[PDB]
Design a protein around this nucleic acid. Sequence first.
RNA 1: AAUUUCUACUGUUGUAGAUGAGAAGUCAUUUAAUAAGGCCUAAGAACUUUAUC
DNA 2: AAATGACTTCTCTAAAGGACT
DNA 3: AGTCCTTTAGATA
Length: 1264
Amino acid sequence: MSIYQEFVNKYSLSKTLRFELIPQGKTLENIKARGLILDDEKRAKDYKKAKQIIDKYHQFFIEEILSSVCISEDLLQNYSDVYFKLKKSDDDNLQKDFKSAKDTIKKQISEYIKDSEKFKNLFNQNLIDAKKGQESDLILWLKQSKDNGIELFKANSDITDIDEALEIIKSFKGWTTYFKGFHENRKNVYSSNDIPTSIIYRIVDDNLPKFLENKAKYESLKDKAPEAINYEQIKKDLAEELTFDIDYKTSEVNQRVFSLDEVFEIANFNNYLNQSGITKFNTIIGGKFVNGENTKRKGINEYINLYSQQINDKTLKKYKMSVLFKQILSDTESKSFVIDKLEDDSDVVTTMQSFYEQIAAFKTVEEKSIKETLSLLFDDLKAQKLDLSKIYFKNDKSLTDLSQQVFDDYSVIGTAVLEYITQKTEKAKYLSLETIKLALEEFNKHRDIDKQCRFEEILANFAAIPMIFDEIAQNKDNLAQISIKYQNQGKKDLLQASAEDDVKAIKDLLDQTNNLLHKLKIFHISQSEDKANILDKDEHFYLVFEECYFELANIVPLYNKIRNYITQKPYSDEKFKLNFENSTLANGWDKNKEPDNTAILFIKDDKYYLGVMNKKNNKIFDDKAIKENKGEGYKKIVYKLLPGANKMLPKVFFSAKSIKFYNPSEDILRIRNHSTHTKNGSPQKGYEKFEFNIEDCRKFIDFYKQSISKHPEWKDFGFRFSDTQRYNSIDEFYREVENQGYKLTFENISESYIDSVVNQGKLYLFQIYNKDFSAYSKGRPNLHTLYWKALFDERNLQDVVYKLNGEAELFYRKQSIPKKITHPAKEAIANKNKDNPKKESVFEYDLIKDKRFTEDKFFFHCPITINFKSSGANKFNDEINLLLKEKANDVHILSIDRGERHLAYYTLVDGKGNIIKQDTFNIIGNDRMKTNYHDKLAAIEKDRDSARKDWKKINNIKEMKEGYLSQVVHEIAKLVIEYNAIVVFADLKVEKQVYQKLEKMLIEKLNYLVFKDNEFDKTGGVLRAYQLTAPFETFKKMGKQTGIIYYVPAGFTSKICPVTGFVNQLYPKYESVSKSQEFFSKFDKICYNLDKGYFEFSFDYKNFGDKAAKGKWTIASFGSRLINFRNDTREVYPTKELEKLLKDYSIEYGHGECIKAAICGESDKKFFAKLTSVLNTILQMRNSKTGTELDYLISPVADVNGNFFDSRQAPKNMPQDADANGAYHIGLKGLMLLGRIKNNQEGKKLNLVIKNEEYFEFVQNRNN
RNA sequence: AAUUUCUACUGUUGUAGAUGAGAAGUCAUUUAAUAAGGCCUAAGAACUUUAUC
DNA sequence: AAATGACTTCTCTAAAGGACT
DNA sequence: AGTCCTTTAGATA
Ligand SMILES: [Mg+2]
Ligand SMILES: [Mg+2]
């Protein structure tokens, strides 16, 4: 029996259920005869375009507003000062000092945009369909732009010009409220609320702090690395981006190149508000590419990086600047060169023809082909025809590659010159070939006779380069046949997967050309003007070579152009919205709205149906029709709902049309006008908010109760309210109104009436369907089927848990693959499970791969609310902790880790620290297939990496991860309930993302946890789901606990002895021979014990420089250990590789000698090198092999019985391997939290931060 | 190898588990290309820093 | 530049009211 | 005047 039986019906949540819709009888033929699906297909395209057209207007409006905005230096400085004082301090004085400063700037920007005339009509019917004889704001702006010759839509292929846009806008004339969701998305762009969709948030919450942090990095930088930035280069390189019209500190409106100090003046933040100012600021930081220049113009960050690598000061990396985030809705245009963009397949073959024809037709000034020239030059190079003191290699990575390519090894050349010159320095930018030959021939007498690198292995490498030109000649053979396949204007066929083998041929030609250019690059001498040192060169060689190199170098933009096109994802049809001619289809189920929102639900013989009324026949279910056609057939749902009580009651009782009937007294109007019935509600317009008065609240509730009982319809809800003196705030009354203002009833409608209206196309009827509704389905249904049926179940309607919401949507999805009969009826099919008792299965029917995608389908997305009458758990974590304190002796800890070998690894631990269960999650259960998901995901990740590199389609991995994790979540939920467990995670495409996704899916499942085997009305069943995590808002709001899930710091959890708590904090790495002689006499004793046959190192961690480390330890040379390298991992024994360190230096320890003095009185440099290396082999507790085998954890610190923990030989209540050890210590950190929860005393806060000292103390001292 | 949809199946016109949609915006990352740089916490069958796209 | 993944916002309404036929 | 699309009403850590 669970400690959690009360954590049920705690808070409400929203969900969507999805179903197929199966048209019934003649509804499909009737739908087709009126062309409703094709018209909605077109409307979805038109609606996307209308929204693109409206956004051009928003783009204009945002620029116009931000050009007007000026934030005062005073407000910015006040922001800056408290921003940096909440660094360094967290006094509550400042926290609302900061919120006040922030909010002053937000209100200022808000007033500016509420000032424009364009704002008032941005979100209403005046935008596109103004009355009365007025022009629509959007139509006007479109006409004005057409008069100013502005071409808004040359940038998107869907819209020809302004006149097509105007047609599109006008086609939505009676359809303004269809835009209501989109208008809410656009209101979010301008909100002053603290939401990240707004330009105000983008300016004040994102970009202002980044700018200020950048100002502080600039001032710190000038103090500590003054010559890092070349101020005169940057003024010349980025003068365009340093130009501004207004200096906001001096306020002069002269347009000039600003100084770096001026851009970081706080007033000039007003120049980085809109997108053009953000891009200027970002270019100052990041430089640009300019067409024609080979070198890239540098920005601030590049100077910071280079100076930091030139003087090797790693501390300047903290000064890297942060880019400002883009402005919301803006288009991005770079200030670096923009490559041409190919648009179709024709552009691909035309662009490649043009390049490879030029390369073939080109002649040098000596009238020779590129191939003839290169053969001529390189054959003469090999024949020693050339003066190799006149030929050079660039002394950069191209020479790095040349050694690594020819001698399989870098720096056989690079090292060979650092020697022959020695036989003070600076980088020589180019190196003679004679210097190369003479240097390495002397380098090869130092070198082994076998391992010897000739100079003419280099001259061989180049004699072979003209080889490539008729491999490329043959590659343009076959490509000529591929070229005609694809030269069609506009067709884009080359993005499809059928073209993959042709694309491989296009890429391999491009890659051979590209490889060719990179091999020759080692010869090219640039015209970048530093002429600080130039060379005397064979001038004929460089004449014709450079001409050839320049022609071939056009491969660079060609390669990018083609990649940027071929790697596009093809266009694919997706499902689209169906409207059945109704702009408010299914917006609300209420009986009074059925004529407007033409959707109706029916039940018949345990099946469910959706009916859509034809627009022309929308009275088909009015009261008269229902009485005249009552009969057995279909049970029509009657839905009554009173939503948003806090808005709906005043709306109705104070309306112009009804206020005289409801007759609120002057007292009631006073309370309303000043909102004294609320704590933080809105007064009426013109009135000031006065303070909450509970007596006023209760008079208002009583006015509401009297008005409800007089209301012609709402009284039929049969409200039963608490006594008004029991309410302490008006939300407690609105909740009772909402809880009870929801009723489902049923009318019986004759089957023949439904049939007749379906046959005539007056009703469109669909069965609501998933496979659980099949007459054959005899298994446990899906959770979502259980929720759906619960909506209408009389046990739910007695006391509503599941509630049906308005704003459902209908979709149509076209067939996307051919109907292939993959497994024909009555032919045996092999079973994949090799452990299955049936090696094959046979069916009386066909089996069709992906059958749902082989025909057109209708769908129904239906929103619901779960726990409809439950009260948000604002103190949910506090309630959990109260329970965990009372029941702390039943609680287990389920801690989950990850690592290289495990997507996730768990340990279940009891209150004493015993492991009860421990295993990897790589293989599930109880999974009959025994799939190793660690191998499966790694195989998908590698296939995706190859697809990117081969320009092939990139498959999805997230569905693969979610499907695996859905089984892990299921296992964790059973373990939580079975063992009264809490779940503990370590705080923090690469599957360490799986760990984060596991957390996310587990939190969501524990928001609302139903066990399908439990009974409907009992704990864990459909009406009483467990809620064990807190309602999820965001991750920043989440903190370190959500319900029974806790996050603990990650440090020191894997490499730590599970018995002694020992951790290597020595960090022994070697450098100086006295620091080592200092390091080792820093011990208490080093000794030998032959009772046991191993050495000892007694020491206290405080006598070493790190004072964080506590405790005296004696570590021992006991046991095996392993080590990797690269040709692989070997096995070593430290307690005897020690004797060879004692044989060469004639130490002797044999009879128990305290050996400490001897090692400190040696100074062979590398006697220490072995000694330090064998000491950290002692501290290496985690020990892995390159094999498929697991890795174990061994401890060099003995327990009280003097035994040494080994994971290979460990009791079941202790870690069985090293990965288990990591999860175990996450769990021990959870035991600490459980002890704080248990020992907390009522009133005071729970401290859940665990510092390492507390952890080390806990782990070191719980055994002793 | 069937699905509201996803994963694994054959569990037999389906079995098991999971499944909050639609709309909007933004950020992050990967891969390629390119520039100037480091280097045997990782690596020349290169590894890697900053930056542009 | 192409691509996928992940995060944060809004809605999940009946009825009053206005414009037009 | 009746119709029907668009706007409206504005709690609660
Ligand atoms: Mg089932
Ligand atoms: Mg499948």
